[PDB]
Amino acid sequence: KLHKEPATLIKAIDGDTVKLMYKGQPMTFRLLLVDTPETKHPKKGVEKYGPEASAFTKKMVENAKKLEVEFDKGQRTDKYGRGLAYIYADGKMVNEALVRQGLAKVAYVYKPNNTHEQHLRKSEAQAKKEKLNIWS
């Protein structure tokens, strides 16, 4: 049974990456299951909707009363040392909000870290049917 834990914002880094204080430690978190356009992409650089995805994640985590992290059932860190998690801002999952807005795609998924996969895929279908941002 997945469970949420509190965390405190340190800095938003990108649409898909946020630095948080978690159980007393500064940690970088990668948002599970979503690919956003990046402002800091390894090769391309500042892609299209990158600033926008990045501004959405920032406003959302910066304006929250409560932030919570939710680890999935598999590995909890990636090869870069980043936490792998669903992030919640006052009860609303940031990963889903990005996708619902057409500001992220559902990433390639790796079992068993796929608990909220269907939910996300349903919001992605909606944003595409509404032709939002990425999908217009």
From Swiss-Prot:
Q: Where in the cell is it found?
A: Secreted
Biased-composition ranges for Basic and acidic residues? 116-132
Region (Disordered), start-end ranges: 116-136
- So where does Ca(2+) get bound? D16, D35, T36
- Can you tell me which residues form the catalytic site? R30, E38, R82
| Protein name per UniProt | Nuclease A
Q: What is the lineage of its organism?
A: Bacteria, Bacillati, Bacillota, Bacilli, Bacillales
Which part of the full protein does this chain span, and how long is the full protein?
A: 88 to 223 of 231
